[PDB]
Ligand SMILES: *[P@@](=O)(CCCCCCCC)OC[C@@H](COC(=O)NCCCCCCCC)OC(=O)NCCCCCCCC
């Protein structure tokens with residue numbers, strides 16, 4: 432009905448871990464997001480990359496995105512695009528910004544583990560306690576096969592062990608060295624960087640935000656316990672019609688006990704921080720961020736469809 436989200440450059444929504452554009456070709460990762468933006472006069476494109484893989488490397492997700500960004504420009508007549516990444520997606524959008532500045536006009540990250548995930552360190556530490564190392568073989572085989580069965584194009588390019596390593600606190604620290612951005616502040620500071628970036632003479636408008644439903648609220652005998660601020664305590668229906676609200680609150684407790692502090696379930700506040708931080712106050716878990724698990728969210732959670740809508744308006748008034 433409107434031209435509210437009518438940006439100058441086309442929007443490309445980049446998925447994260449486990450993702451694709453539509454699971455099994457039916458479940459949209461960005462639930463009703465592309466549609467909502469379309470109605471409001473925006474040109475939106477949703478990337479289909481590997482659900483399980485690293486961002487760098489010839490056969491990585493970054494190159495899959497560059498290739499896709501290229502075809503979009505070839506299909507739109509555009510010169511640059513607006514990368515909007517979620518989770519590993521923001522880490523993937525960054526790669527294209529770095530390696531191909533001219534084709535990128537802005538990078539926006541939604542709950543992106545720029546410094547990594549403490550939960551990725553955990554899951555890997557749990558894999559290492561198998562002295563034989565067969566858990567890593569069989570669980571990766573399993574998770575890769577999920578990638579293929581739920582990818583809309585049944586993409587065989589899945590490396591689960593690469594995807595889990597890419598997301599660890601220590602490996603992301605190497606990523607940032609190898610792919611520096613002006614929107615990144617010093618490692619270990621829980622501080623962001625500059626709002627814009629300039630590579631090869633090309634200006635990118637850097638933005639980001641975070642979900643912080645899981646806050647640490649009680650420390651007893653060393654053991655830290657958290658609260659899911661997205662929900663009305665106990666009686667909230669989101670804990671019923673959404674298995675991820677409670678799953679993320681479980682992963683979110685493992686996080687606080689590993690020093691993450693306030694997090695969205697799998698990403699910390701400190702790790703999500705990039706460029707221009709518009710908010711970290713959202714009472715959202717990791718999926719609420721993408722209006723995920725059939726449009727369901729707790730009662731104290733803001734409308735994520737509205738947030739990505741006000742942002743596309745912000746990109747428009749920004750000149751991108
Ligand atoms: P980001 O890319 C990476 C965040 C860092 C996390 C590392 C986990 C280590 C392997 O985000 C991508 C995903 C995150 O998905 C989740 O964490 N889901 C919670 C798993 C939870 C379980 C805890 C049980 C605890 C007792 O964002 C999503 O994939 N989104 C989509 C919903 C997809 C539903 C698909 C159904 C397919 C039948």
Ligand SMILES: [Ca+2]
Pocket residue numbers: 673675676718719723724727728729
């Ligand atoms: Ca949810």
